[PDB]
Amino acid sequence: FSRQEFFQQLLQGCLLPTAQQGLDQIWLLLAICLACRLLWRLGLPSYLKHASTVAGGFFSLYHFFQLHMVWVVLLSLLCYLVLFLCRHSSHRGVFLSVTILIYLLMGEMHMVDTVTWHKMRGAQMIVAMKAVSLGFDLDRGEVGTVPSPVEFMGYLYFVGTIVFGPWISFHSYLQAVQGRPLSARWLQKVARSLALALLCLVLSTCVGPYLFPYFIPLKGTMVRWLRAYESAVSFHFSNYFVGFLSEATATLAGAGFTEEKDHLEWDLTVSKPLNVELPRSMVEVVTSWNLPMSYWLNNYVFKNALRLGTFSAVLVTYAASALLHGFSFHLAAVLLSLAFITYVEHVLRKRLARILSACVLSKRCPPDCSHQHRLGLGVRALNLLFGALAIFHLAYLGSLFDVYGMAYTVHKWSELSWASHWVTFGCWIFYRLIGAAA
Numbered sequence: 001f002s003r004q005e006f007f008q009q010l011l012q013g014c015l016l017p018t019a020q021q022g023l024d025q026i027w028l029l030l031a032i033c034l035a036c037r038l039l040w041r042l043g044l045p046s047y048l049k050h051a052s053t054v055a056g057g058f059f060s061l062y063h064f065f066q067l068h069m070v071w072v073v074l075l076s077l078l079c080y081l082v083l084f085l086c087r088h089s090s091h092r093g094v095f096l097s098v099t100i101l102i103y104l105l106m107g108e109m110h111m112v113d114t115v116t117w118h119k120m121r122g123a124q125m126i127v128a129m130k131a132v133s134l135g136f137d138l139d140r141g142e143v144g145t146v147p148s149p150v151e152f153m154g155y156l157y158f159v160g161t162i163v164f165g166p167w168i169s170f171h172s173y174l175q176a177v178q179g180r181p182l183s184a185r186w187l188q189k190v191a192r193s194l195a196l197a198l199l200c201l202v203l204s205t206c207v208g209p210y211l212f213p214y215f216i217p218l219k220g221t222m223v224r225w226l227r228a229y230e231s232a233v234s235f236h237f238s239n240y241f242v243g244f245l246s247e248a249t250a251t252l253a254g255a256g257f258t259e260e261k262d263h264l265e266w267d268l269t270v271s272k273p274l275n276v277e278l279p280r281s282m283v284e285v286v287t288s289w290n291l292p293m294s295y296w297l298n299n300y301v302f303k304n305a306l307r308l309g310t311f312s313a314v315l316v317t318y319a320a321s322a323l324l325h326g327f328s329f330h331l332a333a334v335l336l337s338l339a340f341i342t343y344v345e346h347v348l349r350k351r352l353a354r355i356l357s358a359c360v361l362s363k364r365c366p367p368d369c370s371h372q373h374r375l376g377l378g379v380r381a382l383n384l385l386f387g388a389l390a391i392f393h394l395a396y397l398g399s400l401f402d403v404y405g406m407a408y409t410v411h412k413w414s415e416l417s418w419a420s421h422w423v424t425f426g427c428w429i430f431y432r433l434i435g436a437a438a
């Protein structure tokens with residue numbers, strides 16, 4: 001159909017169906033999160049709160065993954081067994097990371113059904129991240145004592161962070177357990193997150209795939225890049241939907257607050273869509289994609305891998321991220337390319353900023369920075385060029401996620417003539433050249 005028929009049938013075709021579907025598969029999880037929030041304000045003892053969220057996590061996992069949930073349950077039991085066996089060692093994070101590596105690699109080895117494994121990659125990822133983070137926090141001394149079984153199981157089965165939930169620290173979980181007075185700000189945060197989630201879902205399913213044929217008036221290279229861009233933007237809005245839904249669930253369960261200067265702010269942010277859609281740098285894109293995940297990776301993989309060098313630690317962090325999302329060849333290729341893209345662009349922007357004394361770093365400079373040129377036309381032009389390069393990289397990497405192993409990835413990146421890899425290689429060559437010239 002043409003644009004006229006498409007916009008005649010849009011509302012009853014893809015707005016209301018997608019919205020209804022997305023709402024009808026989250027309403028029970030939202031109800032359990034609200035029940036957990038109301039139950040945790042009753043002044044119950046802490047162990048009863050942990051047991052209640054364990055039961056809620058079991059029921060939510062059963063609701064979304066049927067009988068298959070056993071793999072997440074066995075992972076939680078195995079994680080507690082490993083944590084208890086090495087509870088007096090200073091390498092709890094080492095043992096937990098090794099056992100997570102074994103478990104995930106066993107699942108990737110197809111010992112478990114492909115559909116079953118792929119179904120709950122997210123929940124399993126969050127459980128693994130929580131266990132590894134608690135082990136490393138016990139190692140570094142951020143968590144004082146080894147938790148009791150009910151506290152650990154409640155942390156793993158926190159109903160606000162069980163299905164699509166953002167990784168939260170053990171201290172953040174315990175703060176949620178304490179509970180905060182139900183305020184207007186809290187409810188506004190939940191409502192805003194839910195509205196943004198539904199908007200992003202609608203955009204991902206309706207606007208995204210049909211962006212260029214209808215919405216924008218605008219098999220040559222241009223056509224291919226347009227299809228790549230719309231597949232990327234649709235994938236981005238799907239991620240944003242998951243992020244905002246996770247914010248809504250976590251806030252609605254009572255987590256995601258910051259008690260700063262005796263002033264409570266419900267400001268849990270999982271994804272920053274504006275910093276990806278309108279990107280300054282690819283580093284910013286990667287960070288803003290999933291702030292809890294990026295912080296977890298940087299804190300618990302990057303800092304522990306610094307003995308191998310900066311670049312090797314970046315590769316280890318991206319490989320751990322690839323394993324956490326499940327080994328699919330397109331996503332593994334995207335993350336392996338993202339390691340090179342982010343590292344090359346970061347070091348090139350640092351070198352450019354140092355040589356030109358300009359605010360062209362991968363992030364915004366603080367108000368007190370030594371760069372001579374801060375708001376000039378050349379600085380704005382260079383930042384715009386790097387943002388256009390970031391959009392180009394986003395379309396290239398997101399072309400793999402249209403709605404598939406080595407051949408599909410090679411074909412899709414050859415239809416784009418391997419353009420982003422050539423741009424990354426040229427940027428690295430430029431980096432080396434400018435450094436050599438000094």
Ligand SMILES: CCCCCCCCCCC(CCCCCCCCCC)(CO[C@@H]1O[C@H](CO)[C@@H](O[C@H]2O[C@H](CO)[C@@H](O)[C@H](O)[C@H]2O)[C@H](O)[C@H]1O)CO[C@@H]1O[C@H](CO)[C@@H](O[C@H]2O[C@H](CO)[C@@H](O)[C@H](O)[C@H]2O)[C@H](O)[C@H]1O
Pocket residue numbers: 090091092093094097098100101128132136139140300301303304305306307308316319320321323324
């Ligand atoms: C496929 C990639 C993943 C592989 C995972 C399995 C392998 C195990 C990795 C465990 C890992 C996490 C990083 C990866 C996380 C992965 C998460 C996975 C999530 C799901 C995907 C733990 O990291 C270590 O944790 C220790 C405990 O926290 C900590 O120790 C300290 O702090 C404690 C206070 O915090 C305190 O109490 C404790 O006393 C302290 O000592 C270390 O500082 C930290 O490096 C990395 O292991 C470390 O790696 C190092 C160089 O990489 C390696 O050093 C080597 O260096 C030279 C060689 O170049 C060589 O010359 C050295 O001789 C050799 O020593 C370490 O030996 C190894 O231990």
Ligand SMILES: Cc1cc(-c2ccc(CC(=O)Nc3ccc(-c4cccnc4)cc3)cc2)ccn1
Pocket residue numbers: 235285286287289290293294295297298302313314317318321322334335394397398401
């Ligand atoms: C197709 C596509 C995908 C994506 C995309 C997918 C997944 C992710 C999750 C992820 O791996 N995050 C991450 C976070 C932090 C680090 C890091 C490295 C070194 C030091 N400290 C931290 C590394 C990786 C991100 C983006 C974006 C745009 N198009």
Ligand SMILES: [Zn+2]
Pocket residue numbers: 358359360365366369370371374
């Ligand atoms: Zn500056």
